[PDB]
Design a binder for this molecule. Structure first.
Ligand code: URM
Ligand code: URM
Ligand code: DA8
Ligand code: DA8
Ligand code: MN
Ligand code: MN
Lengths: 277, 277
């Protein structure tokens, strides 16, 4: 925990009367940063997190046909995800033999965890070691590739990611679960953001809290014969409404260029959808 | 530590493509919020901190003639400082009998701590109970009055406050200690901000770390026959350069209207200088 001093660093002075970005909201109303290109000096952040010998776990599920996405996912993670930091990939699959042999950089390891042919929330919270092995957990979809830097700027006790389809939408248009019979229910007059289920994370403790809560809520819904409109994403949205994230990632971090192009407000496309279905 | 769910709340939706403030920097390059009016929803923050039964300690020194400032300081603190939260004032003085009898709101207490006729840094770190009694410490000058809200928006593990004289200045003009013989030395090409010694704080653990480090550095300087240009403020600046604060308060939180007026960029003057000397 004790944090040693940063070394001398030479970098541009932040200027108080000059915003980093004037086109987007860069802090939430509960004083959580919203992470966009131009808001962070990665050299400062890399120093801070390296001085703590930070280890990041990345969970990814590749079940049935989705094992086909692992090669590009992992090879591009090696180019772009937390480079220079300690990384432990946890690949959950029903086909351990189908996991591609991917060459890893130093300080990085991969574990194949076999699961049977609620699953993600249940598996992350009560199956999965994480408390002993990593400091932060990052939980992502596999049908994706990294194209640009995804680094320690995302790390914080709890984060969600703005869904690329809805970041400009008003809350009444968000596809929250709207049936009061569901544990994921959010009224039309509530909601901060629509977070996508495909990229969330935080400290191990906070991710375990989130995934446990979502799993429990999904079990209640199952017992009551209701399934939320967007499954675990609906529950994730309910949890993050009631437990505010300490950072929010911009849609740079979860994008679909085929569907949504490359808007001016995105200076980088960092982690992007690969064609499926 | 475990955080219960927030209740349902009705408030304006934050809009991603609408900044709260376009005239000022609202996040540092290490992703610490810079606290300005318009950046926070105090209802959300009050809920979050009340659900933790947060207790805030406020330290203030009133030695020799400065005991005269206590009445206005404390009476205005009662109107504006952390109202609704648990507050423990710690008044350090050489004249306990000169401390005014100030009426306090419920959930608020005051302790008079006698000291002899480095003192603040040494006293806060190794004399002073804080770990047992409060969650956060806020350390301020006494030659001041509260005019507007100062609340839980400031609370974070470690914060400093932008000096009202220098928030628009370039770093070469900052009055950092510039002699390499001083522990407080900062070269002309380093520095983020010029923080004022008159308002800093954080968790008890981080404030004890800061004050211990500054006290130790000041003792080294004394042993070497050098006194930093701005005394404890010079050391505070060195510490916060090397240990980045997790929030930075805007000059709303430390202002002198006689000297600097009321610029457009300040929507509120919250904690202001009273004439002295
Ligand atoms: O056969 C499979 C199916 C899924 N998966 C795993 O589940 C992840 C989500 O599914 P998908 O990407 O299709 O949904 P998207 O539309 O990108 C993601 C969204 O829709 C989901 C249902 O299809 C949920 O509602 C989720 O909460 C929401 O974010 C996928 O990346 C794999 O890691 C797998 O391993 N094998
Ligand atoms: O006789 C005294 C003298 C001081 N104090 C106490 O010290 C605080 C700082 O002093 P002051 O406000 O004069 O300095 P300012 O210019 O506002 C504050 C600045 O200058 C200081 C030296 O005068 C230091 O350099 C400090 O670090 C810097 O911020 C004052 O508010 C009292 O709580 C006291 O109790 N009795
Ligand atoms: C409003 C216009 C539609 C914007 C995109 C909708 O994306 C879909 O949103 C759902 C919630 O309403 C849910 O998260 C699935 C999501 O579809 C996924 O993500 C998209 C960006 C695409 O990559 C799509 O293929 C994928 O299934
Ligand atoms: C540049 C123009 C001068 C701006 C104000 C300077 O304030 C003084 O700054 C010193 C560091 O350089 C140190 O912090 C003392 C500070 O003076 C205090 O704060 C001012 C705002 C006034 O209230 C003053 O009376 C007080 O002594
Ligand atoms: Mn997907
Ligand atoms: Mn003062």
């Amino acid at each position: 925990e004790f944090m040693v001093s940063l070394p001398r660093m030479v970098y541009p002075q932040p200027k108080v009367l000059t915003p980093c970005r004037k086109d987007v909201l860069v802090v939430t109303p509960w004083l959580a940063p919203i992470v966009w290109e131009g808001t962070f000096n990665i050299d400062i952040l890399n120093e801070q997190f390296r001085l703590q010998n930070t280890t990041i776990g990345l969970t990814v599920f590749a079940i049935k046909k989705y094992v086909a996405f692992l090669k590009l996912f992992l090879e591009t993670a090696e180019k772009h995800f937390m480079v220079g930091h300690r990384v432990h990939y946890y690949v959950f699959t029903d086909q351990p033999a189908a996991v591609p042999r991917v060459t890893l950089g130093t300080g990085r390891q991969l574990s194949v965890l076999e699961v049977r042919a609620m699953r993600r929330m249940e598996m992350i919270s009560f199956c999965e070691r994480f408390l002993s092995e990593v400091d932060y957990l990052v939980c992502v979809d596999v049908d994706m590739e990294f194209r640009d830097h995804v680094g320690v700027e995302i790390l914080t006790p709890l984060f969600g990611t703005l869904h690329p389809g809805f970041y400009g939408s008003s809350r009444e248009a968000f596809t929250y679960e709207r049936r009061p019979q569901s544990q994921a229910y959010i009224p039309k007059d509530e909601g901060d953001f629509y977070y996508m289920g495909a990229f969330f994370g935080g400290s191990v403790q906070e991710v375990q809290r989130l995934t446990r809560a979502c799993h429990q809520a999904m079990m209640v819904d199952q017992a009551n014969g209701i399934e939320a409109v967007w499954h675990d994403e609906s529950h994730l949205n309910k949890y993050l409404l009631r437990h505010k994230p300490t950072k929010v990632l911009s849609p740079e971090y979860l994008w679909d260029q085929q569907l949504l192009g490359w808007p001016a407000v995105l200076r980088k496309l960092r982690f992007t959808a690969v064609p499926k279905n």
